Design a protein around this ligand. Structure first.
Ligand code: CLA
Ligand code: CLA
Ligand code: CLA
Ligand code: CLA
Ligand code: CLA
Ligand code: CLA
Ligand code: CLA
Ligand code: CLA
Ligand SMILES: CC(/C=C/C=C(C)/C=C/[C@@]12O[C@]1(C)C[C@@H](O)CC2(C)C)=C\C=C\C=C(C)\C=C\C=C(C)\C=C\[C@@]12O[C@]1(C)C[C@@H](O)CC2(C)C
Ligand SMILES: CC1=C(/C=C/C(C)=C/C=C/C(C)=C/C=C/C=C(C)/C=C/C=C(C)/C=C/C2=C(C)CCCC2(C)C)C(C)(C)CCC1
Ligand SMILES: CC1=C(C/C=C(\C)CCC[C@H](C)CCC[C@H](C)CCCC(C)C)C(=O)c2ccccc2C1=O
Lengths: 735, 180, 75, 41, 74, 120, 160
């Protein structure tokens, strides 16, 4: 009953099971630990970062090793459009003979790989199960390096100080230039040297790379300035990927669009992209001042940025010390940027597939988009939660105020009511009218008169599609016109490739849109606005409100303030995160439902099914869920089973976890404490069991813990059931 | 505030004509989101001068037939801009540069919240001594004449645009400018 | 809800139906209760998914009000 | 009939009467000019 | 209130029902005792319950109860 | 109502030259004339309403300051009403004629609806 | 035309939809007898369907590839009767409602028992205010000018 929460003496003195539960959930909140200083905080965070990167590299190495050992990578190379990639083998003693037979792939039961790693590794120039093994070996070596570094930087003479950790200019210069630019430069080097010849049949391994010229002229044009030579003779339109037939000699080109065979971006396009990004980031990494008297001091930049007329208060004067001294502000900024970035990855890796033969891998396309959108929602909610935490525990009004006037951040708490009221107005506006139009379509179609539907053509979005060259909406605007200056300017660089790809019905590049797209985009906007409303309200109201003008004194996460003053359930800022998680899950569900139904109709060919039935709710319920759930639920029946049996089991498992979350959310404490007391009496008053007694007094889960557990069940069930549905439906419908 | 500013005359009684009270919205709620009366008056002078110049530039070339030698002979203001933009790109570029320089030197951005060293449409610019030595009432009367002529030119240019868009919107227009 | 689900499925599968002139009994669903009501996947598929076909396909018919109330009750 | 008229002035009765009247004229507009997808003008 | 509800049920059976047609063909006519006004296209709810009648099929079993009571006329 | 009754009687009798103004029936003339002439009448009546009540046009705004005899627009160019002795009789006559004209305006409009030809 | 759509008067799928609906209604009509009310109702349904389709055809309505009228709400006055005119109508009506509600709230807010007059409406005063909302655009831009529309600093604020 002691010594487990070593970091908290208050918990270690708890005589109940709450100590164990809270010991888990407070282990990473280093700022709240006993005998805590800032130096130890930054050093522990640094070591934890090292361990985390080691974990990531070990996970990647495991994926590589299992593809190399139990996969069919080599067979998939020779026939990427017919051979289904294998993730890893299965050894489960609970299998019957039927399950073994159904999951049997080649030599052993195995799982199909939906991560798209086969296409990614094939694109970057891997052709052998020994290339994957080398990658796994190297990644385990890197993990060992990172673990050694993490141990080393906790040693006495190697523990960095607060000044080093808060040295913003040095870290920015190095991160930008070194990390981004130099990693892009090295990736361009690999892309060219290995990937470009490997796509043309020439093997460039760790033996013949110092003697195989990536370009026939060989670094002469680069120093000579004849950089056009690297773009001459690109890959033809009859080039077979991985073979020298119809190949070229160029390494950096503009082509635009996709490879005619793999239906993916040109490797020479991506090498040029990464070279340009490398140059730009290396240049941008010299901005801030270091030991050589030139550069920028960001404190001065922030302080000097006050509009002269005066509408942002005193400007950004106090922001430098605010961000530097708070790890939650930086964490929130990083999480918001990462969420936007992974939303970008999801939205671009389906419209512009970058890996060979990934466009025809429909289950992996759906899985990748869903995975990245869910990660995006999680990251955004985390960014807002950490902003709220910064408000609660790191924000100092004195730093952000100069002689009564407030800086740009402190002024966000002055018109907080205006911000929240207008977020509420936008949410109500969008919800009222999107639901009104959807229900109008529902009722009108149900009454057998679909012509009375309200169908709004998304002209604004179709205008953008025409601006990028789509000649489908008869707009003749910028790139849909051959005479506009936008078209004449790039008529010789990348329009022929771009136009040939955007004006193609088999791509996902700028999918044609209609009224259903309009309505679902408005639903998405409503979801985004409502999630933002909850999170922003929790962040701004974190330090106090009218119901609790001292909420900052109770911390970020506390159960309530009691039944007084009318009742104060879910009044903390943590509860705002807890409520906004449901809205994030709902919004990501809407986004992924829209994406998956649109792409299922596109792949099956019945795009008229979406364009007609997507305007009313029953259309969704009947033609997406009810229609495509048939292959999934018949993964095992009283007659047999298929390789989709695991997905049906996961479907039911997700439903069960969802409803257990419903348990933990609807039923609150107090009802579970008295029942536990009855159980305690029963155990204490029964023979043959009195010999065994608990060391920690069994008590009901706390209010905040119960909310967390219900949210965890809700989210896990949500994710599992939707993953099972999307994967099984795609597999069982599209062969 | 409008009682002590140039712009009102016998045509609208003796009071400043302001049906919508737009001159008094600057002092209303907000630090500044709606223009001050000084910004509105500078917009008056600028729009009126531009409208007078544009009326001359649609009347003289289009009707009288006077044209700069190496410029397109297009008696139509809806195409003359593009025609000269292609025919003499350097001339249009120099005109744009001169306009930008003139406006940047005479910047009116502190007029939005009220204030600044300049007056409403001061601009210096008295070459031929028309206001060399005059009574204050005479200068005010000349300013009022300028403002009223600018408003009239605004109305004339709006009428041009309306008749081009909606035919028959100005009945006497084609009988008062017989050529395009 | 479980009681009424049991009643509906059991009656439709093992009581209700039509009788042929020679005495052959054919039920509404066909006796699937005995073998497919013993798993949760069976309840999900052979009862909920299977018998929800009439509700979702009621649009445009005289039972469309039932589909509308289905959606509204979900809401 | 002094307190009965005050009872009819209560929020529920007034809201019920107003919503009944509102639904009434909406339903009757839609009966006399049905299937109006756009503005009649 | 209960008596008013029962009176409404009997009135609907008397005026807006196909009870007389259902009496002559209980095994082939579906009981209906509520007709729907033709507004906003909702007249599709008037189903083909049989007996030269259009309306909403009734699942409360009032027709069978009335027949068991000996009620043979509206 | 008085002006509208006189309008009926004159319209069925006199009418204006032109194809649009050729319906002896007032109800059908409301449709044949088109929206353009009617909307001009609507806007002119609005201008009159604004200028005659001098801004205060609503139930809560009018008579808020008092000093406004009900129905007293001051309109009397021909000078009938200088003598206060006949002023009360003129007011009563105007009220009675207005009420009678409301009843008659309803009567004429509904006669045109149930028959369709004219008033005669 | 706009957005690749075509007028519904020349949309073959629109006429196919009309023909299919009429055929279904006539097939339903076949199973009833003589001039009985069911046949009259089905005939009225057929007539209303034909009238609605004809009106939609002659309405400057653009139909997609599904033969359904699509709304052009980018702002152009050509299709102004689809969104813009109903938008103006709703803005007028909703501004009327909001104005009369605000006026009633502010009027009974200066009496002895403001809360009593909110559950028990002063029907005379309510009727007086409600019929005065036809000038809400003018009343709003006569109270905003006088500063009587917006509060300044008597509004309450939370602790931070
Ligand atoms: C060249 C020198 C260099 C390099 C390579 C690094 C590299 C790194 N440092 Mg580091 N550091 C440096 C110098 C350097 N540092 C110096 C000089 C200081 C002292 C001032 C520090 C202080 C420091 C601290 C205190 C910490 C690090 C950490 C890290 C690691 C970050 C985690 C990671 O793996 O990110 C990998 C990231 C990438 C490979 C690139 C990310 C790609 C992004 C997401 C895509 C963005 C593209 C685009 C913009 C998207 C938007 C679209 C656009 C249209 C807007 C990383 C390995 C952290 C860590 O984990 O420690 C172990 C940490 O806590 N460093
Ligand atoms: C007036 C002095 C002068 C001038 C005008 C040049 C001009 C040039 N030198 Mg050069 N050079 C100079 C002095 C000079 N050098 C001196 C003093 C040395 C050392 C003793 C060198 C060593 C040198 C090398 C080693 C190379 C050049 C090269 C070049 C050419 C490549 C430029 C280019 O495309 O950028 C290329 C742009 C980038 C590399 C990045 C931007 C260019 C004509 C290159 C070449 O091949 O010329 C034909 C080359 O490889 N120079
Ligand atoms: C790199 C990103 C990052 C980082 C560094 C942190 C770091 C931190 N967060 Mg944070 N957070 C993040 C992302 C991040 N978070 C995101 C994305 C969200 C939104 C979901 C949140 C939401 C959040 C909240 C709401 C809170 C924190 C808190 C904290 C602090 C303490 C963490 C703690 O006690 O862990 C405790 C760890 C746990 C309780 C483990 C939970 C594990 C979950 C339930 C998943 C495990 C189930 C697993 C999937 C099993 C699968 C089931 C199977 C059947 C399939 C710490 C500073 C807390 C704090 O006090 O901050 C000051 C706090 O209240 N964060
Ligand atoms: C289908 C279920 C459902 C529906 C319809 C709503 C609807 C709403 N929620 Mg919500 N919510 C739900 C489930 C749901 N929630 C769940 C499960 C949670 C997790 C606890 C939350 C958590 C939550 C939070 C934390 C917040 C909302 C908010 C809102 C409002 C957003 C504005 C809007 O759309 O106005 C339009 C309203 C509708 C479309 C629904 C009502 C309209 C009906 C049909 C009118 C019928 C009249 C007869 C709205 C009332 C936010 C809010 O209050 O914004 C102002 C807010 O802050 N909700
Ligand atoms: C560019 C358009 C424009 C603008 C900004 C103004 C602005 C002004 N005018 Mg002015 N005016 C204009 C055009 C304009 N006018 C034209 C075309 C005429 C001729 C009919 C007049 C005739 C006129 C008179 C007779 C008087 C003014 C006065 C004023 C001043 C007080 C009224 C006010 O605040 O209006 C602000 C106006 C706007 C912000 C313009 C909004 C226009 C909207 C978009 C609707 C336009 C279409 C209908 C102010 C500086 C009064 C003055 O000088 O007081 C001393 C005065 O007595 N003007
Ligand atoms: C971000 C835009 C921006 C800013 C902040 C400035 C700032 C300045 N300009 Mg300037 N200018 C700009 C754009 C801008 N310029 C452009 C595009 C041109 C045309 C080529 C000019 C031409 C110009 C001239 C000719 C002169 C100035 C001058 C000045 C200085 C003071 C006088 C003044 O403001 O009047 C000039 C005011 C303007 C020109 C108005 C510009 C309005 C811009 C275009 C609006 C942009 C706002 C928009 C929201 C930005 C979007 C951000 C993001 C979404 C991309 C001041 C430093 C003067 C100077 O040098 O003083 C010594 C001067 O004589 N400017
Ligand atoms: C309260 C709003 C309202 C309004 C403005 C009207 C308006 C009208 N109704 Mg009416 N009506 C209403 C509610 C309303 N009704 C209700 C609640 C019912 C009962 C369901 C009826 C039942 C009804 C019948 C039965 C008839 C009208 C008729 C009429 C019209 C002539 C009187 C007129 C357009 C008559 C009509 O025009 O039909 C030819 C007619 O015969 N109404
Ligand atoms: C909130 C979004 C929304 C919007 C914009 C509409 C809009 C519309 N619906 Mg609709 N509807 C909605 C929600 C919505 N509905 C919901 C939630 C449902 C489910 C209950 C329905 C069910 C529904 C049906 C069943 C029908 C419509 C119909 C209509 C159309 C005719 C409207 C009408 O009667 O005008 C005429 C009435 C007015 C303009 C009233 C104002 C008149 C006042 C008195 C003017 C006075 C001041 C001068 C119109 C396009 C009808 C149609 O024909 O569709 C094309 C139709 O049959 N709707
Ligand atoms: C004015 C009127 C209607 C006017 C209608 C108009 C202009 C309609 C115009 C339109 O239709 C058209 C042309 C075309 C349409 O598409 C558009 C509109 C615009 C809609 C009805 C009056 C209708 C007037 C009515 C019904 C009056 C009823 C009076 C009664 C019952 C009086 C009874 C008493 O007088 C006695 C009998 C004895 C007394 O002592 C006691 C009392 C009790 C006072
Ligand atoms: C609470 C809080 C927080 C947080 C916050 C957040 C979380 C936020 C988010 C945010 C976000 C999330 C934002 C976003 C943004 C975005 C943007 C800003 C965008 C932009 C874009 C653009 C600008 C584009 C443009 C263009 C186009 C459109 C076309 C193409 C080209 C170009 C580029 C031109 C913190 C911690 C800080 C602090 C405390 C408080
Ligand atoms: C069911 C339920 C309970 C009862 C559930 C409890 C007490 C959890 C029971 C123990 C779970 C099943 C874990 C058991 C783990 C094993 C005993 C192994 C020990 C592991 C620890 C050492 C970590 C609550 O206490 C409660 C409190 C507040 C709101 C809602 C609820 C609620 O819904």
């Amino acid at each position: 009953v002691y010594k487990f929460p070593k970091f908290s003496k208050a918990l270690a003195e708890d005589p109940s099971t709450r100590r164990i539960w809270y010991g888990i959930a407070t282990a990473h909140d280093f700022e709240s630990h006993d005998a805590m200083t800032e130096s130890k905080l930054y050093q522990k965070i640094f070591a934890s970062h090292f361990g985390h990167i080691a974990i990531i590299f070990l996970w990647t190495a495991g994926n590589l090793f299992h593809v190399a050992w139990q996969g069919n990578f080599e067979a998939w190379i020779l026939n990427p459009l017919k051979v289904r990639p294998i993730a890893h083998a299965i050894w489960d003693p609970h299998f019957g003979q039927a399950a073994y037979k159904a999951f049997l792939k080649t030599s052993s039961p195995a799982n199909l790989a939906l991560s798209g790693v086969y296409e990614w590794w094939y694109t970057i120039g891997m052709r052998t199960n020994n290339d994957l093994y080398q990658g796994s070996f190297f990644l385990i070596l890197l993990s060992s390096l990172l673990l050694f570094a993490g141990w080393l930087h906790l040693q006495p003479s190697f523990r960095p100080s607060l000044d080093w950790f808060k040295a913003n200019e040095y870290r920015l210069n190095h991160h930008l230039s070194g990390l981004f630019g130099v990693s892009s430069l090295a990736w361009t080097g690999h892309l060219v040297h290995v990937a470009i010849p490997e796509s043309r049949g020439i093997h460039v391994g760790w033996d013949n790379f110092l003697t195989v010229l990536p370009h026939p002229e060989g670094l002469t044009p680069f120093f000579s300035g004849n950089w056009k030579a690297y773009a001459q003779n690109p890959d033809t339109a009859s080039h077979i990927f991985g073979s020298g037939e119809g190949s070229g000699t160029a390494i950096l080109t503009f082509l635009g669009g996709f490879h005619p065979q793999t239906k993916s971006l040109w490797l020479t396009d991506m090498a040029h992209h990464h070279l340009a990004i490398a140059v730009l980031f290396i240049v941008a990494g010299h901005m801030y001042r270091t030991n050589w008297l030139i550069g920028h001091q960001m404190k001065l930049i922030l302080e000097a940025h006050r509009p002269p007329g005066g509408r942002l208060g005193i400007g950004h004067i106090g922001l430098y010390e605010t961000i530097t001294n708070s790890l939650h502000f930086q964490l929130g900024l990083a999480l918001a940027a990462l969420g936007v970035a992974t939303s970008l990855t999801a939205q671009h890796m389906y419209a512009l597939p970058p890996y060979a033969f990934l466009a025809s891998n429909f289950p992996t396309q759906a899985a990748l988009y869903t995975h990245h959108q869910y990660i995006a929602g999680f990251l955004m909610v985390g960014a807002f939660a950490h902003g709220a935490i910064f408000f609660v525990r790191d924000y100092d009004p004195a730093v952000n105020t100069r002689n009564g006037e407030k800086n740009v951040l402190a002024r966000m708490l002055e018109h907080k009511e205006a911000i929240i009221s207008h977020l509420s107005w936008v949410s109500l506006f969008l919800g009222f009218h999107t639901l009104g139009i959807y229900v109008h379509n529902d009722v009108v179609v149900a009454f057998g008169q679909p012509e009375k539907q309200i169908l709004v053509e998304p002209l604004f979005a179709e205008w953008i599609q025409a601006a990028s060259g789509k000649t489908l909406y008869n707009f003749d605007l910028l790139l849909a016109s051959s005479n506009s200056p936008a078209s004449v300017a790039s008529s010789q660089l990348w329009l022929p490739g771009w136009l040939s790809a955007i004006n193609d019905g088999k791509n996902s590049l700028f999918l044609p849109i209609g009224p259903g797209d309009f309505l679902v985009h408005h639903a998405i906007a409503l979801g985004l606005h409502t999630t933002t409303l909850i999170l922003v309200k929790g962040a701004l109201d974190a330090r106090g409100s009218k119901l609790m003008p001292d909420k900052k004194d109770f911390g970020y996460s506390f159960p309530c303030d009691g039944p007084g003053r009318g009742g104060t359930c879910d009044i903390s800022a943590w509860d705002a995160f807890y409520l906004a998680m449901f809205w994030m899950l709902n919004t990501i569900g809407w986004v992924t439902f829209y994406w998956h139904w649109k792409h299922l109709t596109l792949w099956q060919g019945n795009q008229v099914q979406f364009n007609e039935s997507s305007n009313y709710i029953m259309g969704w319920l009947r033609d997406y869920l009810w229609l495509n759930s048939s292959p999934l639920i018949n993964g095992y029946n009283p007659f047999g089973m298929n390789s989709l049996s695991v997905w049906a089991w996961m479907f039911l498992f997700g439903h069960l976890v969802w409803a257990t979350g419903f348990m933990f959310l609807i039923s609150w404490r107090g009802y579970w404490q008295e029942l536990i007391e009855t159980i305690v009496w029963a155990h204490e008053r029964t023979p043959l069991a009195n010999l065994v007694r608990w060391k920690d007094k069994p008590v009901a889960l706390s209010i905040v813990q119960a909310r967390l557990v219900g949210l965890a069940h809700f989210t896990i069930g949500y994710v599992l059931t939707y993953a099972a549905f999307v994967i099984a439906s795609t597999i069982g419908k599209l062969g | 505030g409008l009682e002590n500013q140039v712009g009102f005359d016998i045509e609208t009684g003796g009071k400043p004509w302001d049906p919508f009270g737009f001159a008094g919205v600057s002092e209303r709620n907000g630090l500044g989101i709606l223009p001050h009366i000084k910004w509105l008056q500078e917009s008056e002078i600028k729009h009126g001068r531009t409208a007078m110049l544009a009326f001359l530039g649609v009347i003289v070339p289009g009707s009288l037939g006077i044209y700069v030698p190496t410029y397109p002979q297009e008696p139509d203001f809806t195409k003359a801009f593009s025609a000269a933009l292609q025919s003499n790109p350097l001339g249009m570029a120099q005109i744009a540069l001169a306009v930008a320089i003139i406006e940047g030197h005479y910047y009116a951005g502190d007029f939005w919240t009220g204030g600044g060293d300049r007056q409403v449409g001061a601009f210096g610019f008295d070459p031929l001594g028309f206001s060399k030595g005059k009574s204050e009432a005479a200068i005010k009367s000349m300013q009022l004449k300028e403002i009223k002529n600018g408003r009239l030119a605004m109305i004339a240019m709006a009428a041009f645009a309306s008749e081009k868009f909606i035919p028959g919107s100005v009945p006497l227009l084609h009988s008062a400018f017989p050529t395009l | 809800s479980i009681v009424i689900f049991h009643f509906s499925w059991k009656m439709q599968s093992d009581v209700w139906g039509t009788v042929s002139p020679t005495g052959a009994v054919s039920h509404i669903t066909g006796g699937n209760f005995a073998q497919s009501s013993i798993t949760i996947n069976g309840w999900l598929r052979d009862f909920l998914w299977s018998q929800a076909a009439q509700v979702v396909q009621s649009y445009g018919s005289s039972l469309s009000a039932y589909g509308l109330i289905f959606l509204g009750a979900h809401f | 009939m002094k307190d009965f008229l005050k009872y009819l002035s209560t929020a529920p009765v007034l809201l019920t009467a107003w919503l009944t009247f509102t639904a009434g004229f909406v339903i009757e507009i839609n009966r006399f000019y049905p299937d109006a997808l756009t503005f009649p003008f | 209130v209960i008596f008013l509800w029962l009176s409404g049920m009997h009135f609907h059976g008397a005026y807006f029902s196909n009870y007389s047609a259902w009496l002559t063909n209980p095994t082939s006519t579906k009981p209906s005792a509520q007709i729907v006004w033709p507004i906003v296209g909702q007249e599709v709810l008037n189903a083909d319950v049989g007996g030269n009648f259009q309306g909403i099929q009734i699942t409360s079993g009032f027709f069978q109860l009335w027949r068991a009571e000996g009620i043979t006329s509206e | 109502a008085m002006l509208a009754f006189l309008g009926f009687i004159v319209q069925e009798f006199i009418r204006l030259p032109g194809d649009l103004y050729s319906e002896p029936n007032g109800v059908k003339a409301f449709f044949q004339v088109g929206p353009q002439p009617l909307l001009q009448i609507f806007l002119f009546c609005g201008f009159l309403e604004f200028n005659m009540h001098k801004g205060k046009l609503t139930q809560v705004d009018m008579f808020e300051d008092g000093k406004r005899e009900p129905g007293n627009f001051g309109f009397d160019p021909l000078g009938f009403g200088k003598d206060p002795a006949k002023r009360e009789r003129y007011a009563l006559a105007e009220l009675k004629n207005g009420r009678l004209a409301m009843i008659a305006i309803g009567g004429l409009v509904h006669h045109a609806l149930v028959t369709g030809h004219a008033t005669f | 035309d706009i957005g690749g759509l075509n007028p519904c008067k020349d949309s073959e799928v629109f006429q196919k939809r009309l023909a299919k609906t009429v055929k279904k209604l006539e097939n339903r009509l076949k199973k009833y007898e003589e001039g009985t009310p069911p046949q009259i109702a089905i005939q009225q349904q057929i007539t209303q369907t034909k009238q609605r389709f004809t009106r939609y055809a002659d309405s400057n309505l653009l139909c997609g590839n599904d033969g359904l009228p699509h709304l052009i709400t980018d702002g152009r006055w050509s299709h102004g009767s689809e969104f813009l005119l109903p938008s103006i109508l709703f803005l007028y009506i909703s501004g009327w409602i909001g104005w009369v509600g605000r006026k009633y709230i502010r009027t009974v807010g200066q009496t002895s028992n403001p809360t009593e007059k909110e559950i028990i409406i002063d029907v005379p005063l309510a009727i007086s205010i409600m019929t005065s909302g036809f000038l809400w655009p003018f009343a709003a831009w006569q109270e905003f000018l006088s500063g009587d529309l917006i509060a300044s600093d008597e509004t309450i604020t939370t602790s931070p």
